[PDB]
Amino acid sequence: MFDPAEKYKMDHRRRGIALIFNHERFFWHLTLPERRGTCADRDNLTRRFSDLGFEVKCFNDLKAEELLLKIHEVSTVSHADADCFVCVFLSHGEGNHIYAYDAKIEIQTLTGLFKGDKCHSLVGKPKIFIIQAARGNQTNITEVDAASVYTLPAGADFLMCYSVAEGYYSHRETVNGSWYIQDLCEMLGKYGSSLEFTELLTLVNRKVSQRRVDFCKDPSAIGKKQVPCFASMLTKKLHFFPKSN
């Protein structure tokens, strides 16, 4: 008796874990610039996901070894009593790679740890990755990076969310944070608890697409528009309705 309005089952004891890997500085010999403003992104994300019931776990400037250890740990813990899983990357990236402090890591090996095969307690539950990563470029200045990270599609019941698409530019204010993440966090605040999450992400696409880029303090930053996207492999409507204590 197939149902065109089926919602993911979101009535488990806990909402689930939200990992946030936050990268401001890099090993000297990588020659990658500071990401001044990433802490606003981390703090804004932490607050909005907390208010939706996530156990938010933040990690600053982890080396590759440390990051793989923490994310493997979280992948092999039981999610049996959880609604879903959220993982956020705030760093530099290139192609299919995010940068840790130390070295780059294949995104597919991070998403792979949560695929049905390898994490049974999350089968049929939403797995949401959010990626603010672009190319390292070198009071509140707007820095602009070229898109660099492929808009990849993980696997069944994953939702991959991207700051910026091929041929567009990602913006980060050095105090206020990334345009994508400001607008994601504003929409989580107003609508997180009512709207279907892909409906919300679409609002975010509108908000960021509409940010004007014709009258910039830097002449070279003029006409560098920003368009985010999401790659959905979801199989049901996704809501973060308030949980019943």
- Distance in angstroms (rounded) separating the CA atoms of residues 7 and 4: 9
Q: Which is nearer to a second copy, 104 or 236 (CB)?
A: 236
Q: Which does 148 bind (CB under 5 to 8 A by kind): ligand XN5, a second copy, none?
A: ligand XN5
Q: Which is nearer to a second copy, 33 or 124 (CB)?
A: 124
Q: Which is nearer to ligand XN5, 145 or 183 (CB)?
A: 145
Residue 153 sits in the site that holds ligand XN5 (CB under 6 A): yes
- The residues with which 117 forms a beta bridge, in sequence order, are none
Residue 123, SS3? coil
Copy the structure tokens of residue 33.
């610039």
Residue 148 sits in the site that holds ligand XN5 (CB under 6 A): yes
- The residues with which 85 forms a beta bridge, in sequence order, are 127
Name which position in 166, 189, 210, 222 contacts ligand XN5 (CB under 6 A).
Answer: 166
Residues that bind a second copy (CB under 8 A): 4, 6, 108, 150-156, 162, 165-168, 190-191, 195, 198-199, 201-203, 205-206, 209-210, 225, 227-237
Residue 233 sits in the site that holds ligand XN5 (CB under 6 A): no
Residue 137 sits in the site that holds ligand XN5 (CB under 6 A): no
- Distance in angstroms (rounded) separating the CA atoms of residues 100 and 61: 7
Q: Which does 4 bind (CB under 5 to 8 A by kind): a second copy, ligand XN5, none?
A: a second copy
- Distance in angstroms (rounded) separating the CA atoms of residues 70 and 86: 14
Q: Which does 104 bind (CB under 5 to 8 A by kind): a second copy, ligand XN5, none?
A: none
Dihedral of the alpha carbons of 177, 53, 189, 234, in degrees to the nearest 10: 90
Per DSSP, the residues of 26-37 read --GGG-----TT
Q: Which amino acid is at 89?
A: F
Per CB under 6 A, residues contacting ligand XN5 are 147-153, 166
